Design a protein around this nucleic acid. Structure first.
Ligand SMILES: OC[C@H]1O[C@@H](n2cnc3c(NCCCc4ccc(O)cc4)ncnc32)[C@H](O)[C@@H]1O
Ligand SMILES: [K+]
Ligand SMILES: [K+]
Length: 546
DNA sequence: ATGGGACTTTTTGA
DNA sequence: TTCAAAAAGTCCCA
């Protein structure tokens, strides 16, 4: 329930917000953490504030009440007017109160601005100069549905559909930041590209100036946590600048403690830096260097079609309980199942470039079982072994599905045809032509070509360009980075891939047919396939003028 | 034990 | 009626 932010990142975020504060002009800064926990950020804020006041104590004494501004009074002043925290966990608040009280070694009742509450519901009675911290991340499966009602009603500007709780914390932080204030947080990176983050990105862009984005990509910032992180720093300062510093990591294998500070890491060869004009951000944030932007714009301008224009996309089967319906093709229980009910079944690891592995699994398409008396053996001995769990699926509880039916069986005829399949998460482009009427779960996506576009594009040509090094780089420019060496390959981005057709079409298609032919024979030569791929990459680069 | 690698279900809002 | 998105992933080992 409580996650420990690495100290190097905590110090960086606090320094980012407070390093240029003019304590003489404003000796009453309000610094807030609305998910403060045990005080990872607030205790560091205390240290930064204490040095800031002590360094200028005589200037404050001369300018202001000379009896109020003494070194002995800094501790009381910081806790009365400067440090604010909120968290739902009262045990964490109690520990943090002890820590803040123990910074100075009662006199009279020092009051500490710590609130045990839901930060998304609190009536915040003033705004803040500086806001730092690490909000909770809770996705759509793990968030309580009753709470989702409240979020959908009151945070609809950033929270719909499959959005995340931390979207709302971005909203709350922005709303209670003072004019001219600065905020700096570490959150998941996914909202930068994800479809769910579209409204949140619009909210950030139009309400704050984004100073800086640190993107750690798939690096493991939180030990033993499967999440990918970024640091955002933003302000509400009236400026004409509108330019963002982007620091994007180059090696995801780095360990965060290479230097004493994060700034040393950011300036090093481990990161690349570039600038993005916030005014030029569309609903998508394309955060790339000038070389990649030129590369991306060339391809976009050259291609007159998208996959969406020419193809029909669909997600795979969702049985709702795979162990009930998926069997090994050598399982003796398949003797009980008439072959009309059986489909070939593949996983994402079975998709290679250009062709699919031979399937080892079979799907019982139980939707075609008419009733429980004709095929009782299949229900009693195979599917019924998981009947309790099958009955807890949403559509079974509501009576839409029989307990033995697939939850989302889709349309059989979409799968039983020539089509292209690709894994939903992969390190690289792997688009394959399926010749074997393979079915799959939602870890594999499929598309087929519209009939009116068959004379312009063939499957062989499509897998040729889509598997090229050019298109691998092109897709990853805007793709959603999930974890180390993993991108989402989902239709909401895959179908936006733009394609071209020019004088090189026939030779690209012929090279693709050679590759497929080699990949499908027995005494397979790996090597010549690579040479043919290099030749095709040259044709594609020639076509797109790169 | 931890940190790194292989691999990916079904719940859920719309 | 029925689509497709979602990693504080999950799980294993040396
Ligand atoms: O995880 C990092 C830190 O964030 C703290 N924190 C988590 N959620 C909140 C919150 N509102 C959101 C409430 C979400 C919720 C709703 C219903 C329910 O049944 C259970 C939870 N407001 C303030 N602090 C919060 C957390 O204690 C921890 O120290
Ligand atoms: K004075
Ligand atoms: K990661």
């Amino acid at each position: 329930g409580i996650y420990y932010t690495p100290k190097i990142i905590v110090d960086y975020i606090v320094k980012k917000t407070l390093k240029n504060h003019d304590i003489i002009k404003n000796p009453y800064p309000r610094i807030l953490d609305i998910s403060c926990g045990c005080g990872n950020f607030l205790l560091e804020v205390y240290d930064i504030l204490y040095d800031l006041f002590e360094e200028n104590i005589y200037e404050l004494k001369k300018k202001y009440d000379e009896n109020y501004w003494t070194v002995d009074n800094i501790h009381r002043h910081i806790l009365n007017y400067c440090i604010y925290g909120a968290d739902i966990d009262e045990k964490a608040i109690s520990i943090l109160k002890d820590s803040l009280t123990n910074k100075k070694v009662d006199e009279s009742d020092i009051k500490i601005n710590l609130f045990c509450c839901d930060s998304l519901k609190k009536k915040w009675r003033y705004k803040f100069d500086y806001i730092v911290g690490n909000p909770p991340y809770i996705g759509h499966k793990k968030l309580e549905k009753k709470y989702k009602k409240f979020l959908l009603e009151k945070y609809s500007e950033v929270y719909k559909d499959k959005a995340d709780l931390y979207f709302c914390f971005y909203k709350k932080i922005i709303d209670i930041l003072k004019q001219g204030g600065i905020g700096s947080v570490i959150t998941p990176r996914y909202f930068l590209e994800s479809l769910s983050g579209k409204d949140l990105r619009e909210y950030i862009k139009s309400n704050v100036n984004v100073q800086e984005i640190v993107d750690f990509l798939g690096a493991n910032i939180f030990k033993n946590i499967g999440v990918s992180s970024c640091i955002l720093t933003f302000d509400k300062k009236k400026t004409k600048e509108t330019y963002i510093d982007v620091f994007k990591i180059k090696n995801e294998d780095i360990c965060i403690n290479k230097f004493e500070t994060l700034e040393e890491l950011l300036k090093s060869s481990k990161f690349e830096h570039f600038n993005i004009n916030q005014r030029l951000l569309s609903d998508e944030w394309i955060l790339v260097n000038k070389d990649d932007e030129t590369f991306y714009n060339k391809i976009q301008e050259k291609c007159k079609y998208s996959l969406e224009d020419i193809a029909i996309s669909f997600q795979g089967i969702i049985t709702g309980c795979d162990k009930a319906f998926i069997l090994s093709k050598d399982d003796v229980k398949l003797n009980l199942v008439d072959d009309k009910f059986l489909k070939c079944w593949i996983k994402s690891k079975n998709i290679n470039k250009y062709i699919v592995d031979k399937s080892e699994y079979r799907l019982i398409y139980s939707n075609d079982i008419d009733n429980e008396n004709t095929n009782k053996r299949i229900l009693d001995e195979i599917i019924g072994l998981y009947k309790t769990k099958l009955e807890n699926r949403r559509e079974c509880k509501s009576g839409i599905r029989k307990w033995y039916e697939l939850q989302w069986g889709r349309e059989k005829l979409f799968f039983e045809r020539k089509k292209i399949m690709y894994p939903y998460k992969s390190n690289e482009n792997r688009f394959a032509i399926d010749y074997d009427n393979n079915f799959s779960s939602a870890d594999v996506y499929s598309f087929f070509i519209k009939e009116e576009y068959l004379d312009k594009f063939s499957y062989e040509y499509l897998v040729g360009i889509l598997n090229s090094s050019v298109y691998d780089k092109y897709f990853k420019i805007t793709a959603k980075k999930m974890s180390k060496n993993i991108y989402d390959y989902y239709p909401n981005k895959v179908m936006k891939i733009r394609i071209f057709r020019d004088n090189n079409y026939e030779e690209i298609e012929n090279l693709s047919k050679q590759i497929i032919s080699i990949l499908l024979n027995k005494s397979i030569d790996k090597g010549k396939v690579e040479k043919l791929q290099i030749k095709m990459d040259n044709l594609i680069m020639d076509s797109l003028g790169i």
